[PDB]
Amino acid sequence: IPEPPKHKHYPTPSGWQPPRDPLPSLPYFVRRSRMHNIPVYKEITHGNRQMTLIR
Amino acid sequence: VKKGFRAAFRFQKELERWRLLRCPPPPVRRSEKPNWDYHAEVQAFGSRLQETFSLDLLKTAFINSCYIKSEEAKRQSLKDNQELFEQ
Amino acid sequence: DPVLRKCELRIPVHRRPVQAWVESLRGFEQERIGLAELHPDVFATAPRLDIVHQVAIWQRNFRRISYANTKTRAEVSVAHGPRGPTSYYYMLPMKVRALGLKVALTVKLMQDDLHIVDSLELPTADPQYLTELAQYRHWGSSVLLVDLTHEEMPKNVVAATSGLNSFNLIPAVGLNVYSMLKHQTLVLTLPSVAFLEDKLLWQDSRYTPLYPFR
Amino acid sequence: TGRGTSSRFLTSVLHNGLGRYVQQLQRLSLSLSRDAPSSRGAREFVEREVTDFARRNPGVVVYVNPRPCAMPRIVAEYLNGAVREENVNSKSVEEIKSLVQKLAD
Amino acid sequence: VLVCPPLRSRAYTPPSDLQSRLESHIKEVLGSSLPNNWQDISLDDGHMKFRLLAGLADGLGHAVPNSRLHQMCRVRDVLDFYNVPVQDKSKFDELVASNLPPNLKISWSY
Amino acid sequence: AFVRLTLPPPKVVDRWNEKRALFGVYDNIGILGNFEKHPKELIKGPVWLRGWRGNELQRCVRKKKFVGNRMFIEDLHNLNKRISYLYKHFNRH
Amino acid sequence: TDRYWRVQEVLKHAQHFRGRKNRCYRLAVRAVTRAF
RNA sequence: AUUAAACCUUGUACCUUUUGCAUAAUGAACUAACUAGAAAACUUCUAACUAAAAGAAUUACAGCUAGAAACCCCGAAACCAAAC
């Protein structure tokens, strides 16, 4: 997969913005996915339970 | 022939149990039997009774004339309990 | 002069590099000669032993073939007896197997069972030297030696390892979880680590294949 | 079961408590294995609680014999000659401590 | 054809004058003379770390574990790492040298 | 029933023999070999089930196809009759 | 492989029975339960 | 239970079947061995990776991949082909 190209102005017209620099110094770090997207997935289970997962 | 060593080992124990019941072993003194320490037992014996005994004197009291003869016979190939016995 | 190694691939900024003592087998006292950096995404993965446990089961079971057979009542000239050759073959995804290998590498390093070496070359071919050296460095009773490629592995090491049952010599492509677990300590050449890292790090952007990669 | 089993009357060994109470238990024997999950609890017991029991009750001879053993086992011998055997296979420290206290009493 | 040298024990006890040995080694590494903020000196330099760690290990007798090697970013960690003792004595070995009472018997058949 | 009156001789097994020692080696041929050779290619055994698994009927049917021409006439007839029972059991019950 | 000892468990409680009951497991087991 | 084997006191053999009942009805001289539950379409659970997932043939607007998870035995009167 090609890495995202550097853009003169962020956010990108679609709306993509790379992770903010400097990274936060919190004890917990959330890395981006291989697709350079936030690792948040909406999920529904049992046909009635809505869920969201951070991986 | 049934396979397995546990079954063969189990039967050997089964045979031993029957043999022991038929022919109980002759009694033997705990001194000869394993896990015996005369010095440790005497200390425990005195503490168990909650009484103070002089180790040397108590051993002499335990010492008997017959015991000395056996040791002397082995020695050929010591204070008796008579004095304490009278008191 | 310390031997300094850096990860060829880009280490994450938020992740610090993993480091270990570079060693050489040339001499008994050559325990530490350099400092090397190891990719956190490879050598600092979470210790997921169930994946390792699954891989070990897969390793034992995908080769499992039972040849037991018996004649049933209809075939008598057993109600539920073995019926001919039976196999248990199944395949784990390459992502899981690579992850399982990644997990195993971290455990050995963290448990001080992994020894990174520059090369396998030995001053002598005597098997005694290798066993004594393992005792000298307090290695486990079983030591696994890995080289970059089978063809180029030194002759001296071959003789020492070939004659030793508990010391097994394998190429880089021959690495597997079962051997690592069976062997108390692992000895890896520096080129092999890069070779393993490349394949393990290749999993990045794992295009689902419509045909073989070749 | 009562018809098919033995019975006795209430009795004391030698009127033990009339003058002074004497502990019947006289000897303890322990077998351990250096590398055995079953004996781990007993092994941990040796580190921490065996000494306290020994100090509390010095009138009982305690034998601890770590040896190649399939199952750890404890043997308790009493003054009257009664001997009781208990297997320590795969038992925790807390369980072992409670059992020993019962044996002493 | 090479004869292995004798094995050494893995037990290391922090020196009573640990600071004196550490500072002397730091002076030995390269002419430092213990400049202020010595504890915070970064070890990221490969050459400096190799000489400092190798020299300290030989004299002090304790070696940085591979697991803990990357943690040794600063001298302060090294000083803390050396001050913690390491004992090779087994639990049974400690028990043997613990004034065993007369009623307690230990026999190691392994 | 009755049990043996003699103990079997003791037996010692070496767990570090080459077969056990090298068991599982090259199992990562594909990932470490650029996927040129799939681990399924390393299977040695009956031809009809090399790299393949199925239910008893599928295994029997595949066996017939692979070695049907090279099987004995008597065996082929027996296999045909056996297949009939297997087919009915799985596909009708 | 312990079926013999299982019978012994019933037999040991049935050793004191009289007649074929003491030697027949089919009857010995029934008597042992009834006694308890 | 007992000092005591029997006495005193208490108590309508067992399995199956009838109905949650048998003083019904079946079956058992006894010993040893042998003697009957087998499948994954979908779902939950356990994980990998994720707008992507599966080592070619598959699905997708959080999906996709992998694993685990299931359904017996004996017994007719008969019927047909080919030999004798």
Curated annotation (Swiss-Prot), chain B:
Family: Belongs to the ribonuclease III family. Mitochondrion-specific ribosomal protein mL44 subfamily.
GO biological process, one term: mitochondrial translational elongation
Main location: mitochondrion
Protein name: Large ribosomal subunit protein mL44
Section of the entire sequence shown: 31 to 128 of 333
Organism: Mus musculus (Mouse)
Any one GO molecular-function label of the UniProt entry: ribonuclease III activity
Encoding gene (name): Mrpl44
Localization per record: Mitochondrion
Subunit structure: Component of the mitochondrial ribosome large subunit (39S) which comprises a 16S rRNA and about 50 distinct proteins.
Any one of the GO CC terms: mitochondrial large ribosomal subunit
Protein's job: Component of the 39S subunit of mitochondrial ribosome. May have a function in the assembly/stability of nascent mitochondrial polypeptides exiting the ribosome.
Keywords tagged on the record: Endonuclease, Hydrolase, Mitochondrion, Nuclease, Ribonucleoprotein, Ribosomal protein, RNA-binding, Transit peptide
UniProtKB/Swiss-Prot annotation, chain E:
Keywords: Mitochondrion, Ribonucleoprotein, Ribosomal protein
Superkingdom per UniProt: Eukaryota
Principal subcellular localisation of the protein: mitochondrion
A GO-annotated cellular component: mitochondrion
Keyword NADP: no
Localisation: Mitochondrion
Family: Belongs to the mitochondrion-specific ribosomal protein mL50 family.
Name of protein: Large ribosomal subunit protein mL50
Curated annotation (Swiss-Prot), chain F:
Listed GO CC annotations: mitochondrial inner membrane; mitochondrial large ribosomal subunit; mitochondrial ribosome; mitochondrion
Disulphide linkage map: none
Subcellular location: Mitochondrion
Domain of life: Eukaryota
GO molecular function: structural constituent of ribosome
UniProt GO BP: mitochondrial translation; translation
UniProt KW keywords: Mitochondrion, Ribonucleoprotein, Ribosomal protein, Transit peptide
Protein family: Belongs to the mitochondrion-specific ribosomal protein mL51 family.
Quaternary structure and partners: Component of the mitochondrial ribosome large subunit (39S) which comprises a 16S rRNA and about 50 distinct proteins. Interacts with OXA1L.
Protein name stated in the entry: Large ribosomal subunit protein mL51
Swiss-Prot record, chain G:
Localization of this protein: Mitochondrion
Domain of life: Eukaryota
Family under the similarity heading: Belongs to the bacterial ribosomal protein bL20 family.
Subunit structure: Component of the mitochondrial ribosome large subunit (39S) which comprises a 16S rRNA and about 50 distinct proteins. Interacts with OXA1L.
The protein's name: Large ribosomal subunit protein bL20m
Organism the protein comes from: Mus musculus (Mouse)
Gene name as annotated: Mrpl20
Portion of the full-length sequence here: 15 to 50 of 149
